[PDB]
């Protein structure tokens, strides 16, 4: 099973950028390698064969190179057309997919804002306690949040859901679920959700006391 | 131009059978071979099978080999995959697609692929949401910004649709992609940014609509 | 100059599986010559339903 | 709905002929071709003959081609089989069938098949059975359980019907399938269980039937 | 003459089990298959045709699979209807019916009750003996019946009879009859009939002396 | 079983006309495609025309086409080639053939063959033999041996059947093969050895029979 | 075109023998090739369908073999029944025999005994002389006669004629006939056949004198 | 031998449709697969389009799929070929060809060719010619030959007749072919070489035809 | 039974454009394909059969084209007789038909006049309510009509018709009926239809209070 | 998973004919190359031939070339091995077995082997065995324990089964395997260990049972 490796996984670019993807096989391909484009909630178009033909219709900025285990996809010129996810595919045997590099808008750091919120009285009358905490508008995407309850670190019982890129103003949003039954919720005093990102000099810390 | 659209695609308990289809026009669809691939999350694109373009040779990924079933009717112009045995990790989403013509002595591959459909392995029943709100309050705000959203928890299958007072209200609207939890029910959050100055006087209303359990909840949020 | 006899002798997967658009358009003179016993034995609905004249 | 009658069938001696008719209701019968397709223990599912809707063309096994004709008559909506020169393992239930409706360029087969008819080739001459009484003693006891029955032995030709105190005992009552014997004779048994504490004083009789010959024997088992 | 040969020839199933049965045939059949289904003392019903096209009133949960020569009839939930023999068939080259799979109506294992019955006096005088040995209220079906005659195996001179499952508690019962002239009859002295079952830790052996 | 008849061959001048039948019996005529097939000592066999169960499509060896057309009565159950402006080479053995039962896609040629009908195309005109002695002598004896014989030459058409003493000598007797002249008459030779004690004596005349001219030649051979 | 070639043209061979001929195509034909045996004086018969496979009523002892361009038959044991003449036939692209291989009785060696007649003297009236060269039982069937006339080789003037092998004792006869013009035989002497054949150690010449 | 007719063919504006039939014979049309091939000054020679010999399959070439279609009527033994959307570069010679018989296996392409029919695609409106005279003079003249002609100007469609002094003068006169000019209006030139001491005293008149305008234009060149 | 598809279903055009609809099958109808024309209020006239045949009396601007599964119908030059309603049918199955489709005559843009009535005095005496709201001189067709009662939104309890194009301007009108019990009419004050239209850039809404 | 069943295989004499198949099962078969391959207790493993998935390439070992011919049915899914002229070498089990899945430029050997088949080239007529008895005395005692047993001798073909007592007797018994002798007979030997202290109380009978012949033969071991 012939693997396929992306290289690298997320690109923060421009528009009028210089962008170089590259794409690796476990074993030698020859020149059987395809690039694909994804948009987002949209199906996948053909973008170049054979390593370094152009698909007909495909502009001219695009371009392909590599032979044996190595290839590499080149846009000369990024255009705001042209944010999207890239997959490379060998079909030399059978067929493997790469995991995918998506392009994504470069603009300059934003920190979040944190919000946290409680659970509500209903939801906690309905036997479960969810409590979320919210990072708004923030870029780059990478951030940390860790969840405390008393000073103790939770693992496990929490998930994250990030959006993507705003059409607008190419920021992110993160909320964090942390979801407890009501005999954990009122077995304990403080909750808290840290947050640190790359445009913070600080952590960010908010935190409510059960009842209060 | 070449078009393609596949149908046949819903929830489905596991070890039960489904039979997707696809429909191709603008071209000569007999003339042709055809793959199917899927795309998730977890393992990103995987291609499940390939056909003949007289349906003499088959291939199947090891994965499902020995439980899918590939054909195609080229008087009907249509191809068709027979998946049973289904297990949790087939939910995906699943594209026809057309191979590319080229030279005889050329390997092969896909140049357009079709629409898609969702395929959802679960043994969740169909159930409306929970909606509880996200009350705004002092810890959640920060100058004249507050933040209060919507908690669309417990529900299945996918999607569910969530709008701010009937539609209104949509600037500063963020809706989080839902995410699959141990229990098999889905959740998710909608949050949007108001002016504090507008608190206690202004309503916010959230309305969910799930079309499959035909549920329809309008919560309202109230500050603390 | 020979032919490796260990060489693959399976079919290859990505092979052309579109159809040969200059393949051969004549029809078969040795080909099956009789009739279908399993062909259509019923009547046709969509025949002829006047006289000859 | 559509509805298919078979009459003809009995007893027949080797080297003689008869003539199947099955009648076709509840459609039109002119529209459609027919087949005739026999069943017996030792080849299982067999195809004997197809016929066209007009006649045109018929078609048959290479086992029964030249002793078999088939035919029909459309204005009576009546199909025919003249069997000649019948051979013994020509025994089986014959059915006569509907060909599908399909399209003008597919293969067709049966979608419908009749009641069947039984034919029997056999050169024995028609018999009343010998019913003998399978007697339960301390030999054929364990427990409070005893067994008994009757064997009806030597008739032909089939069927017999065979009943316990005139139908009033049914519960635990096996009646095996009949066997044809070497003489063409058919011979079958009949047992039941029943509590040893009862034996000596529960009256036992096996009614044997045979509407052919209008044969009816009462035997009463007793034990030993 | 294209053979059909189905497997396996029976299957013991419960309620609610998924079904699956094969069928092959000889040469390429392209797709033009049926299967019918058929039960005891009725005609054959048919339940699909075109390999995998649904007859019109037949039920979802039945489903047909294969192309070439291997075929599949699958049934995704068995129900107490479904109880019947299933018989695939080639209608590509005139028609040829496999032999047959019966499903049969899986229980727990049940220990044959074990009788014998020796020749009456009446067809003594007929001139013929017919010794009869029952196994009552037994499964699975497989059993083995050897005749001894004065400790002496039999062979070509019996004929066995099985019915069909019981439709109150899904037993077998079978009859197993030794045929012998008058004078093979009398010039003999013990007579006894051996059985072996799978439920059976030991054979069982029934026995009888001619007069006693 | 299967049986096919040739008829219609015979003698025709060069640019003539000939239409040669096939009856066929023992079999569905209707539904199988037939061959005509001719056998020639100059060519072997060839292949001549094929034609297709309900006539729609025919086919012609390279030599015959535009000259040969192969027809069909399937309500007569015969089967028709009508042979216009015959050449000298066309003068062979013509059999029909029926095409055998096979697969659907595969290649197809003929497994029963007809009995064949001669065609003799020839612009010579009917003759009867010239009957030559070929006497024995002292050169013609080696031990008690001697060789005598009638030699038939120039008549047209075949055949002629040579006998010896009305039958009565057939030990030793050789007829040979007719053969073909320059002048398109035929020869041929027949020699018989007989005891070489017995010439002088014993007369011995040869038969000459030729049923188209109905001629009968009885020839003695004396020596010299 | 696709040419068709047998061989051997003439093969020998005994009861019992194990008999191979082969037959080759100009062109592949796949294995579309069969096999039809012919009887002197009968129809053909079908023999062998798809260059192996056994028609239906067939002995065991044919067989065939081939694939491409190649193919053979065998005979595994020659019985007298089988003496006959074999065709080939490719059925890939319309339809063209072999010429045929004659399965010939294999005998010892017999010299032939030679007899010549003069012309009669009707035939001299007539205007024509025929001069007839008979050899009689003798085998194998090549031999060479050639006229002479006056010690003068004669070509192009000759007709010969062979029978079948004969049913007895599997021998041949063959008659050589010498046509000349009255004026051109009155216009000689001596009249020869000389007879080779691989039984005589030395050529064998009779001769008469015309008039003589 | 094979014999094919083009019709159809003429004069059609842009946008329009028209359709080209080919009559086929001296050989069974429906046993042999077709193409439409067409032949401009611009492009040479151009596939267009391809037909099996059933119509189980067709192929286009690239510039006209999606506007041509191809059929065949094999109980009429005639091709044919729809066009739609016609655009200016679709003028061109159209043939209808057949493909060569040949092994199962092999690549195929066309042996024989049809006569041809000429498609005109322009949206200029039929007009007759103007006729101007190309006058000898001494400027025209080098020892004793003159060259004089005549101008056709301006004409639509294809083709026009030039004789001079009705035919009787036929020795050194050269008819350019016609060019195309900005306008979509043919003009072409006839020049004929004279000597120059039949000036003044010989009469050359030029007789243009054009048979789709009826025109009929009678020049006398006179000298200057 | 075959199923059949047109589209588009609805198509605006203008007298000498060219005119294209399409017609799907849901299997292979070989030519057996026939076009009808039907105008409103009138009987269905065949304008082609076997998919390109035109039937005598068709001028010659229609023409038919298509095989196996997509069939198209053309008119090359639109004239105004030509507005009607065209039906697709295959017969290679028995007889079935297309949902037709209806050739619009295009103009322009034009908002509608809105007008409200509220019911009448005799017909709440009689026990009924019906509120009618009308769009008059409208195109394109498109429109929507929603009932507002002091507003709240109606469903289920109204019913829309519309006029065909009228001859001497290709205008369309609309009537609204809301039908209410006399007690659920006068459970409310306020009885509004508002109106949306793609010429409209704001919503028309026109009202009345109960009793007024 | 995959699966292959060899059949075909016997006995033949010298210079015959022999056809095995090999029926595939589980997988594509068309898709593979397959070989067949022998064992044979003088040469251990040794190939014998390779065809490719289409047939176009066939291979042969040196030993085996111009007498066998492999050959394939992909519509059967069956591979063929024709030997002819076997001589007494070629007796061995033979393998049909499938090559593995590789990369394009590697080289291919096998991965899944068949069960394998028998063949037995011999001029040994069928014949049933010669049973002598080995029986225990003093000279074959050491202690307790004693050896008595059964010689199988002379005896074609393979195989042939021992037992002791009808099978109630196992524990101690060495049947050792058959070895060919100079005359092509096999011959074996049955011994079983038993007590010294049973000998001349204890029956023992062994049971040869030989069913290429029909052979049953139970012989008592008496000491001496």
């Known amino acids: 099973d012939i693997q396929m490796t992306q290289s690298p996984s997320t690109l923060s670019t421009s528009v009028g950028d210089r962008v170089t993807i590259t794409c690796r096989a476990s074993?030698?391909?020859?020149?059987?390698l395809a690039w694909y484009q994804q948009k987002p909630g949209k199906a996948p178009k053909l973008l170049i064969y054979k390593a370094s033909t152009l698909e007909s219709g495909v502009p001219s900025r695009f371009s392909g190179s590599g032979s044996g285990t190595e290839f590499t996809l080149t846009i000369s010129s990024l255009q705001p057309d042209d944010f999207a996810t890239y997959y490379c595919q060998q079909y030399s045997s059978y067929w493997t997919f790469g995991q995918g590099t998506k392009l994504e808008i470069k603009r300059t750091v934003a920190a979040p804002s944190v919000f946290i919120f409680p659970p509500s009285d209903e939801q906690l009358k309905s036997g479960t306690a969810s409590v979320v905490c919210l990072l708004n508008n923030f870029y780059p995407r990478e951030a940390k949040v860790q969840w405390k309850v008393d000073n103790a670190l939770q693992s496990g019982n929490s998930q994250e859901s990030v959006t993507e890129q705003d059409s607008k103003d190419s920021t992110y949003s993160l909320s964090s679920t942390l979801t407890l039954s009501k005999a954990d919720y009122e077995k304990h005093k403080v909750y808290a959700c840290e947050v640190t990102h790359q445009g913070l000099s600080s952590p960010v810390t908010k935190s409510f006391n059960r009842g209060e | 131009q070449v078009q393609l659209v596949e149908s046949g695609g819903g929830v489905v308990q596991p070890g039960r059978s489904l039979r997707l289809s696809c429909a191709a026009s603008?071209?000569?669809?007999?003339?042709?071979?055809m793959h199917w691939i899927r795309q998730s999350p977890g393992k990103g694109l995987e291609w499940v099978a390939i056909?003949?373009?007289?349906?003499?040779?088959?291939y199947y990924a090891d994965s499902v080999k020995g439980r899918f079933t590939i054909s195609r009717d080229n008087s009907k112009n249509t191809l068709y995959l027979q998946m049973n045995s289904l297990r949790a990790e087939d939910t995906a989403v699943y594209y026809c697609a057309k191979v590319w013509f080229g030279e005889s002595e050329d390997n092969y591959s896909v140049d357009v692929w079709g629409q898609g459909t969702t395929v959802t392995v679960s043994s969740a029943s169909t159930k409306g949401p929970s909606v509880f709100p996200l009350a705004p309050s002092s810890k959640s705000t920060s100058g004249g910004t507050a933040a209060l959203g919507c908690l669309v928890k417990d529900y299945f299958p996918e999607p569910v649709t969530v709008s701010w007072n009937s539609g209104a209200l949509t600037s500063g609207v963020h809706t989080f992609p839902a995410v699959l939890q141990s229990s098999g029910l889905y959740s998710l959050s909608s949050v949007v940014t108001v002016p504090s100055s507008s608190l206690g006087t202004q309503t916010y209303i959230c309305n969910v609509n799930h079309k499959p359990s035909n549920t329809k909840v309008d919560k309202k949020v109230e500050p603390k | 100059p020979n032919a490796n006899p260990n060489a693959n002798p399976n079919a290859n997967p990505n092979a052309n599986p579109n159809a040969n658009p200059n393949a051969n358009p004549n029809a078969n003179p040795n080909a099956n010559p009789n009739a279908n016993p399993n062909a259509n034995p019923n009547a046709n609905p969509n025949a002829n339903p006047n006289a000859n004249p | 709905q559509v509805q298919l009658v078979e009459s003809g069938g009995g007893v027949v001696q080797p080297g003689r002929s008869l003539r199947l008719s099955c009648?076709?209701?509840?459609?039109?019968?002119?529209?459609?071709?027919?087949?005739?397709i026999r069943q017996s223990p030792g080849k299982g599912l067999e195809w004997?003959?197809?016929?066209?809707?007009?006649?045109?063309?018929?078609?048959?096994?290479d086992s029964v081609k030249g002793r078999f004709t088939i035919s029909r008559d459309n204005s009576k909506n009546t199909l025919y089989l003249q069997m000649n020169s019948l051979r013994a393992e020509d025994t089986a239930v014959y059915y006569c069938a509907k060909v599908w409706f399909g399209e003008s360029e597919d293969n067709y087969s049966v979608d419908v098949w009749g009641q069947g008819t039984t034919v029997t080739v056999s050169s024995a001459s028609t018999k009343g059975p010998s019913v003998f009484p399978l007697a339960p003693s301390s030999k054929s006891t364990s427990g409070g359980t005893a067994a008994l029955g009757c064997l009806v032995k030597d008739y032909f030709p089939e069927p017999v019907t065979v009943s316990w105190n005139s139908g009033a005992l049914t519960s635990g009552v096996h009646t095996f399938p009949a066997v044809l014997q070497s003489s063409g004779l058919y011979s079958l048994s009949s047992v039941v269980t029943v509590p040893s504490s009862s034996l000596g004083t529960q009256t036992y009789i096996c009614n044997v039937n045979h509407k052919p010959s209008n044969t009816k024997v009462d035997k009463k088992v007793e034990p030993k | 003459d294209i053979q059909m040969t189905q497997s396996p020839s029976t299957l013991s199933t419960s309620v609610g089990d998924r079904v699956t049965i094969t069928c092959?045939?000889?040469?390429?059949?392209?797709?033009?298959?049926?299967?019918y289904q058929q039960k005891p003392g009725k005609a054959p019903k048919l339940l699909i045709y075109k390999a995998s096209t649904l007859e019109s009133g037949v039920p979802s949960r039945f489903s047909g699979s294969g192309s070439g020569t291997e075929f599949t009839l699958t049934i995704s939930s068995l129900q107490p209807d479904d109880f019947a023999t299933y018989y695939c068939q080639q209608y590509s080259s005139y028609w040829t019916f496999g032999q047959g799979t019966k499903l049969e109506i899986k229980r727990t294992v049940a220990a044959p009750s074990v009788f014998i019955f020796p020749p009456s006096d009446e067809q003594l005088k007929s001139g013929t003996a017919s010794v009869v040995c029952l196994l009552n209220n037994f499964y699975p079906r497989e059993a083995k019946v050897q005749w001894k005659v004065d400790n002496a195996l039999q062979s070509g001179n019996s004929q066995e009879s099985v019915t069909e499952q019981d439709s109150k508690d899904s037993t077998y019962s079978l009859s197993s009859t030794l045929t012998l002239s008058k004078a093979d009859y009398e010039k003999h002295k013990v007579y006894a009939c051996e059985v072996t079952h799978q439920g059976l830790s030991s054979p069982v052996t029934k026995s009888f002396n001619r007069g006693e | 079983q299967v049986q096919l008849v040739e008829s219609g061959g015979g003698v025709v001048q060069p640019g003539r006309s000939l239409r040669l039948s096939c009856?066929?019996?023992?079999?569905?005529?209707?539904?199988?495609?037939?061959?005509?097939i001719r056998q020639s000592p100059g060519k072997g066999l060839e292949w001549?025309?094929?034609?297709?169960?309900?006539?729609?499509?025919?086919?012609?060896?390279d030599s015959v086409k535009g000259r040969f057309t192969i027809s069909r009565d399937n309500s007569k159950n015969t089967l028709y080639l009508q042979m216009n402006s015959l050449r000298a080479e066309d003068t062979a053995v013509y059999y029909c053939a029926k095409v055998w039962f096979g697969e659907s896609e595969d290649n197809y040629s003929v497994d029963v063959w007809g009995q064949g009908t001669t065609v003799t195309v020839s612009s010579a005109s009917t003759k009867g033999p010239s009957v030559f002695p070929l006497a024995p002598s002292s050169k013609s004896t080696s031990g008690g041996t001697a060789a005598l014989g009638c030699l038939v030459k120039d008549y047209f058409p075949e055949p002629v059947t040579v006998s010896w003493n009305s039958g009565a000598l057939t030990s030793g007797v050789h007829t040979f093969p007719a053969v073909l002249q320059s002048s398109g008459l035929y020869s041929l030779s027949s020699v018989v050895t007989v005891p070489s004690s017995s010439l002088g004596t014993q007369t011995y005349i040869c038969n000459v029979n030729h049923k188209p001219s109905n001629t009968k030649v009885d020839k003695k051979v004396e020596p010299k | 075109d696709i040419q068709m070639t047998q061989s051997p043209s003439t093969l020998s061979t005994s009861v019992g023998d194990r008999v191979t001929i082969t037959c080759?195509?100009?062109?592949?034909?796949?294995?579309?090739?069969?096999?039809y045996q012919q009887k002197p004086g009968k129809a053909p018969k079908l023999l062998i369908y798809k260059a192996s496979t056994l028609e239906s009523g067939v002995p065991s002892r044919f067989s065939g073999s081939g694939s491409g361009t190649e193919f053979t038959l065998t005979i595994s044991s020659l019985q007298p029944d089988d003496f006959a003449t074999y065709y080939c036939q490719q059925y890939s692209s319309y339809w063209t025999f072999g010429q045929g291989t004659k399965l010939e009785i294999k005998r010892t060696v017999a010299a032939p005994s030679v007899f010549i007649f003069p012309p009669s003297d009707e035939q001299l009236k007539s205007g024509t002389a025929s001069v007839v060269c008979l050899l009689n039982n003798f085998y194998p069937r090549e031999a060479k006669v050639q006229w002479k006339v006056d010690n003068a080789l004669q070509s192009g003037n000759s007709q010969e004629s062979v029978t079948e092998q004969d049913s007895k004792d599997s021998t041949y006869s063959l008659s050589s006939t010498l046509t000349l013009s009255k004026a051109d035989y009155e216009k000689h002497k001596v009249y020869a056949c000389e007879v080779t054949h691989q039984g005589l150690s030395s050529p064998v010449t009779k001769s008469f004198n015309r008039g003589e | 031998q094979v014999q094919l007719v083009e019709s159809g063919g003429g004069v059609v504006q842009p946008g329009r449709s028209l359709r080209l039939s080919c009559?086929?014979?001296?050989?069974?049309?429906?046993?042999?697969?077709?193409?439409?091939i067409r032949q401009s000054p611009g492009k040479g020679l151009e596939w267009?389009?391809?037909?099996?010999?059933?119509?189980?399959?067709?192929?286009?070439?690239d510039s006209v799929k999606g506007r041509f279609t191809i059929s065949r009527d094999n109980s009429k033994n005639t091709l044919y070929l729809q066009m739609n959307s016609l655009r200016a570069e679709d003028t061109a010679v159209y043939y209808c060809a057949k493909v060569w018989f040949g092994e199962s296996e092999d690549n195929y392409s066309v042996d024989v060719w049809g006569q041809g029919t000429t498609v005109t695609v322009s949206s200029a409106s039929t007009k007759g010619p103007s006729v101007f005279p190309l006058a000898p003079s001494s400027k025209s003249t080098s020892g004793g030959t003159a060259a004089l002609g005549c101008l056709v100007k301006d004409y639509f469609p294809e083709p026009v007749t030039v004789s001079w002094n009705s035919g009787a003068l036929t020795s050194g006169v050269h008819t350019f072919p016609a060019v195309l000019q900005s306008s979509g209006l043919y003009s072409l030139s006839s020049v004929v070489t004279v000597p120059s001491s039949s000036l003044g005293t010989q009469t050359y008149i030029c007789n243009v035809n054009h048979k789709p305008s009826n025109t009929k234009v009678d020049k006398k060149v006179e000298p200057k | 039974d075959i199923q059949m598809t047109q589209s588009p279903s609805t198509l605006s055009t203008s007298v000498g454009d060219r005119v294209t609809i399409t017609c799907?099958?849901?299997?292979?109808?070989?030519?057996?394909?026939?076009?009808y024309q039907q105008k409103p209020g009138k009987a269905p006239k065949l304008l082609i059969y076997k998919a390109s045949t035109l039937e005598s009396g068709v001028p010659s601007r229609f023409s038919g084209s298509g095989s196996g599964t997509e069939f198209t119908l053309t008119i090359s030059s639109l004239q105004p007789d030509d507005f009607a309603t065209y039906y697709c049918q295959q017969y290679s199955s028995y007889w079935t038909f297309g949902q037709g489709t209806k050739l619009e005559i295009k103009r322009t843009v034009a908002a509608p006049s809105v007008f409200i009535f509220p019911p009448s005095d005799e017909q709440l005496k009689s026990g009924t309510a019906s509120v009618v709201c009308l769009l008059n001189n409208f195109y394109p067709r498109e429109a929507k009509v929603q009932w507002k009662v002091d507003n709240a939104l109606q469903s289920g309890n109204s019913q829309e018709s519309v006029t065909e194009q009228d001859s001497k301007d290709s205008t369309y009108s609309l009537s609204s009926t809301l039908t209410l019990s006399k007690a659920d009419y006068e459970k409310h004050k306020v009885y509004a239809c508002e109106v949306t239209h793609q010429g409209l850039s704001s919503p028309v809404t026109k009202s009345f209070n109960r009793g007024e | 998973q995959v699966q292959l069943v060899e059949s075909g295989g016997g006995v033949v004499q010298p210079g015959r004919s022999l056809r095995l198949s090999c029926?595939?099962?589980?997988?594509?078969?068309?898709?593979?190359?397959?070989?067949?391959i022998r064992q044979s207790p003088g040469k251990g493993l040794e190939w014998?031939?390779?065809?490719?998935?289409?047939?176009?390439?066939?291979?042969?070992?040196d030993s085996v070339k111009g007498r066998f011919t492999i050959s394939r049915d992909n519509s059967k899914n069956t591979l063929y091995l024709q030997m002819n002229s076997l001589r007494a070498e070629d007796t061995a089990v033979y393998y049909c077995a499938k090559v593995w899945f590789g990369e394009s430029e590697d080289n291919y050997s096998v991965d899944v082997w068949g069960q394998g088949t028998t063949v037995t080239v011999s001029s040994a007529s069928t014949k049933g065995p010669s049973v002598f008895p080995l029986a225990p005395s003093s000279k074959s005692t050491s202690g307790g324990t004693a050896a008595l047993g059964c010689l199988v001798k002379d005896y074609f073909p393979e195989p042939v089964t021992v037992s002791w007592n009808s099978g109630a007797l196992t524990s101690g018994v060495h049947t050792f395997p058959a070895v060919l002798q100079s005359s092509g007979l096999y011959s074996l030997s049955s011994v079983v260990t038993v007590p010294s202290s049973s000998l001349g109380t204890q029956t023992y009978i062994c049971n040869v049972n030989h069913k290429p012949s029909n052979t049953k033969v139970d012989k008592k071991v008496e000491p001496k």
């Open positions: 056909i003949w373009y007289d349906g003499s040779n088959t």
């Open positions: 603008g071209f000569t669809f007999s003339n042709f071979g």
């Open positions: 074993q030698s391909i020859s020149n059987w």
